[PDB]
Amino acid sequence: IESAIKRVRTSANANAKNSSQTNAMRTAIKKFEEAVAAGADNVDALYNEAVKAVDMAATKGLIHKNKANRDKIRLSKLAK
Amino acid sequence: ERNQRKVYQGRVVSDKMDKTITVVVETKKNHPIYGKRMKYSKKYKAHDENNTAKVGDIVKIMETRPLSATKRFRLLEVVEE
Amino acid sequence: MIQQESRLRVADNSGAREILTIKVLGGSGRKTANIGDVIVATVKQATPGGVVKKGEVVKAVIVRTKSGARRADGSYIKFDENAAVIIRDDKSPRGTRIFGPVARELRENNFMKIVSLAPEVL
Amino acid sequence: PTINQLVRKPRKSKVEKSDSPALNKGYNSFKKTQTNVNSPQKRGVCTRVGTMTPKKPNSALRKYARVRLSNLIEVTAYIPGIGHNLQEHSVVLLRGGRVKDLPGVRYHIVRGALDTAGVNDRKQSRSKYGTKRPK
Amino acid sequence: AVKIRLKRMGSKKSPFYRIVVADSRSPRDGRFIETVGTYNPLKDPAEVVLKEDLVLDWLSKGAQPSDTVRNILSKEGVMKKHHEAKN
RNA sequence: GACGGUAUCUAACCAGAAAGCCACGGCUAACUACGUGCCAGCAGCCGCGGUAAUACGUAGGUGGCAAGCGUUGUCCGGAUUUAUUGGGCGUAAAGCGAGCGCAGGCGGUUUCUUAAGUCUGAUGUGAAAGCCCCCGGCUCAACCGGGGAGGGUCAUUGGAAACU
RNA sequence: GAGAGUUUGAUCCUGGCUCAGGACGAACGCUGGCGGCGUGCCUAAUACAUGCAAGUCGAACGCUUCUUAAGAGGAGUGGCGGACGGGUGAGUAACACGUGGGUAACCUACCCAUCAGAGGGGGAUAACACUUGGAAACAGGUGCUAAUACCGCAUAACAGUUUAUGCCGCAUGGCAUAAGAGUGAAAGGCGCUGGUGUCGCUGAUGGAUGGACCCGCGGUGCAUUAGCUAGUUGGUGAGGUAACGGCUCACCAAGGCCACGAUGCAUAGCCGACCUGAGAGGGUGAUCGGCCACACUGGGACUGAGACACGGCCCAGACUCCUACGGGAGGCAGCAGUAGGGAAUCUUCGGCAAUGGACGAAAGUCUGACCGAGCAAC
Ligand SMILES: [K+]
Ligand SMILES: [K+]
Ligand SMILES: [K+]
Ligand SMILES: [Mg+2]
Ligand SMILES: [Mg+2]
Ligand SMILES: [Mg+2]
Ligand SMILES: [Mg+2]
Ligand SMILES: [Mg+2]
Ligand SMILES: [Mg+2]
Ligand SMILES: [Mg+2]
Secondary structure, eight states: OOOOOHHHHHHHHHHHHHHHHHHHHHHHHHHHHHHHHHHHTTHHHHHHHHHHHHHHHGGGGGEEEEHHHHHHHHHHHHHO | OOOOOOOEEEEEEOOOOOEEEEEOOOOOOOTTTTTTOOOOOEEEEEEEEESSSOTTTTTEEEOOOOOOSOOOOOEEOOOBB | OOOOOOOOOHHHHHHOOOOEEEEESSSSSOOOOOOOOOOEEEEEEETOOSOOOOOEEEEEEEESSSSSEEEESSOOEEESSSSEEOSSSSSSSSOOHHHHOOOOGGTTTHHHHHHHHHSOOO | OOOOHHHHSOOOOOOOOOOOTTOEEEEEEETTTEEEESSSHHHEEEEEEEOOOTTTTTTOOEEEEEEEESOOOOOEEEEOOOOOOOOOOOOEEEEOOOSSTTTTEEEEOOOOSSSSOOOOOSSOOTTTTTTOOOO | EOOOOOEEESTSSSOOOEEEESSSSSSSSSSOSEEEEEOOOOOOSSSSEEOOHHHHHHHHHOOOOOOHHHHHHHTTTHHHHHHHHHH
């Protein structure tokens, strides 16, 4: 009622964008996990793309830096 | 130097569990109205690193973060079999 | 094709939950009713904290039927249950809120308040 | 008692209670339960007005009224004074207090409150019995 | 924000104030951490009491007064000392 | 500067516009008259009333309070009437009908030891407001403000260990 | 730390009843002059007619209307606030509260201090113009357009991680240095004369502030309630959260709680404090302050530093309202106020002058918080 309509609209748009970007991050990560299961040599670049998405999601307020660190650490233990 | 987290001394009552035990303290509060020195057998769960402690054995335990739902305490010693 | 001893669900918050047709109104030997036809009935199951309660004799209106209704243009409506609405002597209802859908055939019979209170009118 | 006994079971006091349980309860029509409320006065509807014979050392016609309260407890009260405007279905206000003559009257009726008319031609102890000044 | 403001006391039409260290989230009269003086204009001039050490410590630690408290601390010389200590 | 042309101050005037409530047998301070006649009614308890009522009702008078008074309802106290402080069990209430014994409660003298209980020093905290003490401003007072004090079967550390 | 009356023909014990005092958010009755200060739905967390309570920024951005290119007004996008303030106490017998502690298992927009940096690019979108939707709120379609909106590209890790040492701690471990590998940032506006100052922008630390979790102890009745639990108890992994951990899943084992009262039932917000009392204690939890919980009932998430959000979203249910009958809309336990219930407890008032809060560079706008006034001999 009281100027909350605008926050409804902006919050829905934010929902769209943030869920899209998190899904992007998760697809990158899942792709890397399947690559580590398949043993292909693309693992080296997929690792870096996953880390890239993780930190770029730590930016823009999707991911808390501790969650980013835990993700990077899990991926590191997978790769190494 | 930093703080020191609470420590208690007690006695074991069960060691049927892996990496953990139960420990009993046995203070004696005075009943609030009638003043009699009552027993008070508070007990706790302690993380044993190696399943060392034995039943009916004196022990010391220091608090720490929750290691389980029950656990809040860390084994330190084994004193009297 | 709603008859005596025929049981009906209730499509309002009047207090009743299940109904039993005592008789059909209109004429002398009417042995059958459909949408828009008024009913005399009992109450076999009522909501506990309800106005209308067990045993009460009351009039009612058939609002949706399996043996459904027909339109001039050959378009026919049918339903998966037989339900009715309790009313007073006037065509107005006892309760305040009708549930489920409702046929358009009632607008000719001047149950306009029920048509309005219903969410969907087919 | 020994102190061990007094710890195993402590002193549990002599339970107390009121001289007017009818005033210490209420009623909500929604959940339909006795709501415990400490109310000095109440409203009621006289379901009967009559006379009763008091105990042995006394002898008289004591005017009572059986009353239906707001909280749906039915209560016998006394009509103090000399004269009353009361009938069956007459709204009335009730206060506490025994009438030592009859046992079954734990309550009194108040004058000058509601349909109860003020006492007529009472000039002394006048607030009691509820009648305005003679100017 | 952490702030150094003044809370209301005394009867109506005869006010009085305590300078106080309050978050902006707390009420006018509610949570506070420290009191560092008090105030009333009911005298012909204004009248003031202060605790220089503690108020200057909170200002250093990051406090942010209101306008009237800034005026008072100016009259008492605390803002100048804080400025000097930052220089 | 909403309050507000309010507080407040000045001057003119009128004793003139401004007191009632309860009780008066004893517990409880406060007494007679008339009517009534176990009726009317009173009543916190004891109890008054049946032709001479300081107990009903009225009048007069007095007493206690006073812009309040009285009444009900609730809480505490008196109530040692749930007795830790601080009660009892022959006859008043109460010793199970009596025993065997698990658990618990209690436990002879004494060396050494500990220090859970206990005692004790210091430190911290126990917000403010409030109770209390000293101050100060509202024509005093309530109230308001300042300062202080105290408050924990409280916590850490450090000793004794007589007693359990 | 005062007692008195009352059992008896009388007496003493025992034992109960009542009274003498103090206090109400009080009510009823009778009476009633004023002033000051405070308090005022304890019941139906019952339903809500009406009005007002959270907006703000043109010095972030582009339009539109009126100004002879000036300022002022309308709707945009964007940011910040809306999670505070205010109300109520239903649920909750438990780390909810109080107190004492811990977090080497943590987070923190705004405010401070410090180290740094702020480069070059892109594609859209509202608004707006037409279109259909017809009562019109709604809503959809085509096209154009700006931003401190959004995207990704350039560099830094001072962040985190692993190695090697050193140091220390209470085991896990923590601090300092160096190295390795990989990753990521941004925004400009105003003013001065490319240099700028101010406000903002991005990373890292530290502090403050508030928040989250964990533990000792404590505070209510029933045993005419004696057994309770099965992700329940623990462990090895994995996942997950700001973070610990059955928080979650699988797997292994069968343990774990309790007569020191578990479990269940009822009751209840807790506390500072308030009334009483010689004290020990009892009773209460109104006003003021603190913590908690709730927002028609139930659930779930999004946004955001912060909610699982009184005056936000979705869904289910109950309840009501306006419709042109096609479809919409709402949630006073915010301040006043209505009805009902009740023994019963307020004006449908003024102002932001103060004090405090949001926003803003600032004036200033908003503010039923709050200031005041009003009614009631409470
Ligand atoms: K008399
Ligand atoms: K509650
Ligand atoms: K709920
Ligand atoms: Mg006398
Ligand atoms: Mg009398
Ligand atoms: Mg006589
Ligand atoms: Mg006997
Ligand atoms: Mg204090
Ligand atoms: Mg006493
Ligand atoms: Mg609301």
